[PDB]
Amino acid sequence: MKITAARVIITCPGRNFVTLKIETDQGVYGIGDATLNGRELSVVAYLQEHVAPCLIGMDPRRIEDIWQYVYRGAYWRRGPVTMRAIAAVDMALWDIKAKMAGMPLYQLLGGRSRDGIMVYGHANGSDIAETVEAVGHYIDMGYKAIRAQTGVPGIKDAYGVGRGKLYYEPADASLPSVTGWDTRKALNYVPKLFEELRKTYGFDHHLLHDGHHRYTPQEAANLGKMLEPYQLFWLEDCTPAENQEAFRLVRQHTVTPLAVGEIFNTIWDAKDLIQNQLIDYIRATVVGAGGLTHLRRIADLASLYQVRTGCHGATDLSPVTMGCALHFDTWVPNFGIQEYMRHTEETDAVFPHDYWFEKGELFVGETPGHGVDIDEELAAKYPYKPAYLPVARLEDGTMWNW
Amino acid sequence: MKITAARVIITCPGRNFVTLKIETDQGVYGIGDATLNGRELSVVAYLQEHVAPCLIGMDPRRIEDIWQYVYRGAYWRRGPVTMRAIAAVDMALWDIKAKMAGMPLYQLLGGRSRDGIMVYGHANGSDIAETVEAVGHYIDMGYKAIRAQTGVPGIKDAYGVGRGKLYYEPADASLPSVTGWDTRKALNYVPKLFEELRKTYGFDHHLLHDGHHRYTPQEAANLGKMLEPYQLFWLEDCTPAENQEAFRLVRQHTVTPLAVGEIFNTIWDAKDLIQNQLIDYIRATVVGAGGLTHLRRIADLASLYQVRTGCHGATDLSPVTMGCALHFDTWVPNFGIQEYMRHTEETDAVFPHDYWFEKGELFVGETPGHGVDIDEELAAKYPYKPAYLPVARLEDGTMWNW
Ligand SMILES: [Mg+2]
Ligand SMILES: [Mg+2]
């Protein structure tokens, strides 16, 4: 059999989503997510103008060969745009293979290792009081894990605050919004949030915090130690990690669990963080890090050091990615947790899927393939609309890490 | 002053080139290269649909701030497409600053450290005999350094062979050409090429060889040792380097100089190769690794360990890049060598530049800015044409590294 077409579909049912649909001369087709928040059209071009033309005529059953073809063949390796394109192709090909096998994707990966998939929700407030209230709401709904983010007095638009209740939509403008930041103000406030959360709700629930690249290694170590009494599930992306040695000082000084990786796109971005045992959870995703084919390798390397998966799951990852992520989560032995930000009703309608949520857990269905599809007619009713992620600047104007 | 427009210009005067032109309300403008061979339109979209809109209204004098804005602001960091876009912006802004300062770019970087810029040419042949003849031609022309690449009996289309005499144009087709490879055949043949070159021309000339990612670390060590008697200037890209530990075995076993980096896009791709002293020449370029702003940092880190610059200089790097590269080469203290593949007459006409070639050396002119400009009217006469880099497969069909 052969690939007859590899079409890119763009839609904005609440926010932008890019999808690749690989069609065959056999009839069966597969789809994959290619969404890169804030730079969506670069992937559209990468696929439409370069990768797709090469796929025509190839044998879609050869997932590994095609992955290697697009990865090595690009010559210029790795990268956000590059790997999003490769991930889209990979997801679509596994979708096709699962459909042809007549089994839901997780069965092809090795079968079910668990029943439900534990997730964490997103509690945010303008201050500690409001954030505490927010966590209680998730506890009431039956969530086992909750991420808590609070605004900080004196800081403009702290990460994860004021852009949704059951979700967080950062890309809020036609041009990047500028947010503020001050480390000292945050170091003096954040620990108090978790102190209050434990005083109010006890220690039964898993509590998470996203440091969102704001701290230096020493500052992350400082914050990590200050958070130890509160037993967090994890302190995420505490410091920029292009330099994988960045987590060394943090790991040496605190026992607060560490997580990182949502912005990683290849195993090469995390091999040292994993092998040097600097993290507890790897956050790489199916769409961000080259599909099931590559994410499997990242998860396996992590398993050697008891590092677990903690897949990123914000709204900018389409339901196609969540479907693939849940099949992955259902099988992977070293599963840790799955981030779950709820999509809009319009998004769910455009991307019919076989996965549901109940009492703090996500469940993948038994539909052959990854269980997700795209209603092209409905998708066409929501035109693309430019939306950027914010940028952060220190009080003196210094460009920082949002 | 403010940026009034950031336009992307596409042209194909012999091959594809993408250029960014930043215009200001002051009148002065600057241009930068954004060409990514084989994936050109992905960068066009990255710039046109995402980055350019953000640049409007910004102060072009703030080179560092804008670099940080586009680098950190993208959120998804690093990458071939990402850094090509950033490099284009950076080159254009330095072009503007140099013009405003009324000085050729090298003066702003710290002034002249040398007169001419030593380059190396590209000698290739279907076999050793023809390649030897080719090296002699470059020696006759006054070249001080020559890269020698030979076809290998039993191997289909060895790297750098059969696609030009004074240059090598890999992107030779509407779809990726498939070349063959066999390591044992090459290991048994390549050393003989250099043995013959030294027997024929002696040891006065610098001789280079591009391993082009074909070998494993152990095989590169083997080849490196076999090449020692011939005193090569360098053995380049001997083994894939996404894993920076890949050069360890090679460095431990041979004293043949090593070079790597044409496909790198950030200092993060080379920090360990440099700090662990695994290479002698870093090949990163102004267009591949984020402009003058970032390449300067890469060169400086290299200098700490006496590693020198050996900028990649194939035809897919436009004259805009060569102009910036020569200003960089003229100033940088740890300059090693500059690769020089000649552009077509049409390309030189579309990109008027003040640099020239003479008896083995390139020279940058004194024109304010980086000395290069683009004739938009002429550029419009050469429409974009899809062209891909080849892929390599082993004899059994295994996707390999071209
Ligand atoms: Mg995060
Ligand atoms: Mg090379």
> Does residue B281 contact residue B334 with C-beta atoms inside 8 Å?
no
Give the number of domains in chain A. Answer: 2
Pairs of CB atoms within 8 A across A/B: 151
Q: Nearest to residue B391, comparing CAs of A60, A65, A72, A51?
A: A72
Residues 6 or more apart whose CB falls under 8 angstroms from that of B382 comprise B11, B12, B13, B14, B346, B350
Q: Which of A50, A68, A263 sits opposite B77 (nearest CB)?
A: A263
Work out the number of other CB atoms within 10 angstroms of the CB of residue A395.
12
CA A373 to chain centre: 20
Chain-chain contact of B78 with A73 (C-beta, under 8 angstroms): no
Helices (H) and strands (E) in chain A, counts: 15, 15
Determine if residue B122 is labeled as part of a ligand binding site: yes
DSSP bridge partners of A260? A282
> Which residue type, as a one-letter code, is found at position A92?
A
> Does residue B278 contact residue B248 with C-beta atoms inside 8 Å?
yes
> Does residue B191 contact residue B227 with C-beta atoms inside 8 Å?
yes
Residues A120, A68: one domain? no
Distance separating alpha carbons of residues A169 and A161, to the nearest angstrom: 9
The residues of A that are catalytic are: 159, 212
Distance separating alpha carbons of residues A122 and A338, to the nearest angstrom: 12
> Does residue B347 contact residue B320 with C-beta atoms inside 8 Å?
no
Report B:335-394 residues touching A (Cβ under 8 A): 386, 388-389, 391
Distance separating alpha carbons of residues A114 and A335, to the nearest angstrom: 9
Distance separating alpha carbons of residues B56 and A276, to the nearest angstrom: 44
Residues A273, A389: one domain? no
Query: For residue B262, how far is its CA from the centre of ligand 2 (angstroms)?
Result: 6
Element (H, E) at A93: helix A80-101
Residues B199, B290: one domain? yes
Residues B355, B381: one domain? no
DSSP bridge partners of A147? A122, A208
Q: Nearest to residue B316, comparing CAs of B163, B155, B213?
A: B163
Report B:59-78 residues touching A (Cβ under 8 A): 65, 68-69, 72-78
Between vectors from CA B218 to CA B214 and to CA B219, what angle results, nearest 5°? 40
Is B10 in a helix, a strand, or coil? strand
Per the annotation, the verdict on B212 as an active-site residue is yes
DSSP bridge partners of A356? A363
DSSP B343-391: PPHHHHHHS-BS-EEETTEEE----SBSSB---HHHHTTS-----B--E
Helices (H), A228-315: 248-253, 271-275, 291-304
Q: Could you tell me if A82 lies within 8 Å of chain B, comparing CB atoms?
A: yes
In A, minimum Cα distance to B266 occurs at: A242
Ligand approaching nearest to the C-alpha of A316? 1
> Does residue A114 contact residue A364 with C-beta atoms inside 8 Å?
no
Identify from B75, B168, B239, B285 which residue to disrupt to test chain A contact, counting A C-beta atoms within 10 A and taking the largest count: B75
Residues A232, A295: one domain? yes
Q: How far is CA B295 from CA A243, B51, B72, B300, B310, in A?
A: 17, 20, 17, 9, 12
Q: Which of A37, A65, A82 sits opposite B79 (nearest CB)?
A: A82
Cβ-based contacts of B36 with chain A (< 8 Å): 76
Which residue has 């852009």 as its token pair?
A: A163
CB-based burial label for B241 (10 Å; 0-12, 13-18, 19+) = buried
Is B226 in a helix, a strand, or coil? helix
Helices (H) and strands (E) in chain B, counts: 15, 15
Q: How far is CA B296 from CA A20, A316, B65, B291, B292, in A?
A: 39, 35, 16, 8, 6
Residues A99, A216: one domain? no
Is A322 in a helix, a strand, or coil? helix
Determine if residue B370 is labeled as part of a ligand binding site: no
In B, minimum Cα distance to A262 occurs at: B76
Q: Is B265 left (phi over 0), alpha (psi -120 to 50) or beta?
A: alpha
Main-chain dihedrals φ then ψ at residue B362, nearest 5 degrees: -100, 150
Residues B385, B260: one domain? no
Residues B180, B216: one domain? yes
- What residues are neighbours of ligand 1 (ion), with CB under 5 Å? A 210
Q: Nearest to residue B323, comparing CAs of B2, B19, B46, B66?
A: B19
Distance separating alpha carbons of residues B100 and B89, to the nearest angstrom: 17
CA A93 to chain centre: 21
Distance separating alpha carbons of residues A83 and B204, to the nearest angstrom: 45
Structural Rg of chain A based on CA atoms = 20
Which is catalytic among the residues B46, B159, B189, B281? B159
Work out the number of other CB atoms within 10 angstroms of the CB of residue A40.
26
In B, minimum Cα distance to A390 occurs at: B73
Q: Could you tell me if A159 lies within 8 Å of chain B, comparing CB atoms?
A: no
Structural Rg of chain B based on CA atoms = 20
Cβ-based contacts of B317 with chain A (< 8 Å): none
Residues B209, B226: one domain? yes
Main-chain dihedrals φ then ψ at residue A22, nearest 5 degrees: -100, 120
The sign one gets for the Cα dihedral B42, B91, B89, A392 is: positive
Per the document, the length of chain B is 402
Strand pairing class (A178-181; A206-210): unpaired
Q: What is the CATH number of the domain that holds B33?
A: 3.30.390.10
What is the experimental resolution, given in Å to one decimal place? Answer: 1.8
Determine if residue B37 is labeled as part of a ligand binding site: yes
CA A197 to chain centre: 25
Which residue has 């500052």 as its token pair?
A: A219
DSSP A258-274: EEE-TT--SGGGTHHHH
**Two structure tokens written together for B212:** 């082009």
Determine if residue A345 is labeled as part of a ligand binding site: no
Between vectors from CA B308 to CA B307 and to CA B311, what angle results, nearest 5°? 130
Distance separating alpha carbons of residues A89 and A73, to the nearest angstrom: 14
- Percent of chain B that is helix, strand, coil (3-state, to 5): 40, 20, 45
Query: For residue A204, how far is its CA from the centre of ligand 1 (angstroms)?
Result: 23
> Crossing angle, helix B80-101 and helix A80-101, to 10 degrees?
160
Q: What is the CATH number of the domain that holds B288?
A: 3.20.20.120
Q: How far is A328 from chain B (nearest CA, A)?
A: 23
Per the document, the length of chain A is 402
Strand pairing class (A361-364; A355-358): antiparallel
Which residue has 């001050």 as its token pair?
A: A182
Residues B121, B7: one domain? no
Distance separating alpha carbons of residues A263 and B177, to the nearest angstrom: 33
Q: Nearest to residue B149, comparing CAs of B139, B164, A302, B140?
A: B164
Work out the number of other CB atoms within 10 angstroms of the CB of residue B229.
12
Residues B50, B113: one domain? no
Instruction: Give, as one character, the DSSP assignment of residue A230.
Output: G
**Two structure tokens written together for B208:** 């280079």
> Does residue A193 contact residue A150 with C-beta atoms inside 8 Å?
yes
Q: Nearest to residue A54, comparing CAs of A28, A17, A97, A89?
A: A89
Residues B237, B357: one domain? yes
Chain-chain contact of A80 with B80 (C-beta, under 8 angstroms): no
**Two structure tokens written together for A149:** 């983010």
| B96: containing domain | 1-104+367-402
Chain-chain contact of B271 with A243 (C-beta, under 8 angstroms): yes
Q: Nearest to residue A328, comparing CAs of A360, A358, A359, A288?
A: A288
Q: How far is CA A102 from CA A4, A23, A98, B290, in A?
A: 21, 17, 6, 47
Q: How far is CA A313 from CA A287, A331, A339, A347, in A?
A: 10, 17, 5, 15
